[PDB]
């Protein structure tokens, strides 16, 4: 948010800086140092399946997405622990043709046995936010059902 004189928390004007406690206008913080760290992958309505292209960072560290509910707790997580850095993990939650393949170069690797079976509790994603575990970049395609349209 933009910095405003009298409204923001700053010691300005006549030396050695002055910030006033007013009623309603008082002092409101401008923003946060390095606000570029905050990124929310927002989930507003219940989603069923998705086709994400996961770009992993570190090898041998569980890489994959986890899902947070409205209170900041985890219900489901698709997490894989690979031996080498995959160029991208392709995950599809579609019931009919599930795909969990780690691509490296032109080679496609099946990631099903390497996946955490206990963390992956449900396919149905609820209202909250998605967190990226050991990922540099992410590209998602969300499919959400509607009974009558």
């Amino acid at each position: 948010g933009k910095v405003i004189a009298g409204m923001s928390k700053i010691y300005g004007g006549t030396a050695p800086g002055n910030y006033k406690y007013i009623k309603g206008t008082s002092y409101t913080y401008y923003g946060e140092s390095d606000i570029d760290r905050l990124s929310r992958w927002d989930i507003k309505e219940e989603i069923f399946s998705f086709m994400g292209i996961l770009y992993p960072k570190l090898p041998k560290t569980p890489a994959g997405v986890r899902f947070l509910d409205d209170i900041g707790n985890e219900y489901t997580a698709i997490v894989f622990k690979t031996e080498q850095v995959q160029d991208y993990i392709l995950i599809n939650t579609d019931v009919n043709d599930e795909t969990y393949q780690g691509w490296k170069g032109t080679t496609a690797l099946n990631l099903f046995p390497v996946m955490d079976f206990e963390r992956y509790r449900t396919r149905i994603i609820e209202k909250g936010q998605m967190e990226l575990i050991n990922l540099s970049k992410a590209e998602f395609k969300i499919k959400r059902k509607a009974d009558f349209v």
Partner: protein, 53 residues
Amino acid sequence: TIKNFTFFSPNSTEFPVGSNNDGKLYMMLTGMDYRTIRRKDWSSPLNTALNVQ
């Protein structure tokens, strides 16, 4: 009949060397049969999930 391979061809057509002839030559030089190999990993193969690269 005798088939010559490791000899010069005066008109560049006399003794062409076929891949199977070199195959046999190489097997004989190294002392290998069809039930073994010669193998060298110049760089280490890499294991990723249920795959070997």
